Design a protein around this ligand. Structure first.
Ligand code: CA
Ligand code: ZN
Ligand code: ZN
Length: 54
DNA sequence: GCCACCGGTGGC
DNA sequence: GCCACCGGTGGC
């Protein structure tokens, strides 16, 4: 429960990255160049994340 | 004013 | 020293 996490929504309760969204595809562990550096789209808090991350 | 980056660090 | 993931912003 931080500035960007309500700790209660479905996104906040996911711990696993989907591996198929733009943010995951950017990640090194999914073969990306690690230039965007955000959490999986599915883990973006529904209440508190920047709107364009949702 | 928005958002794709990019710089930075809390918490290991 | 690393890595997840945040906040600031150049360029639009
Ligand atoms: Ca540190
Ligand atoms: Zn994802
Ligand atoms: Zn949430």
């Amino acid at each position: 429960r931080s500035a960007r996490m309500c700790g209660e929504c479905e996104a906040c309760r996911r711990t696993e990255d989907c591996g198929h969204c733009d943010f995951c595809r950017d990640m090194k562990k999914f073969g990306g160049p690690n230039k965007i550096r955000q959490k999986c789209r599915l883990r973006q808090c529904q209440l508190r994340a920047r709107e364009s991350y949702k």
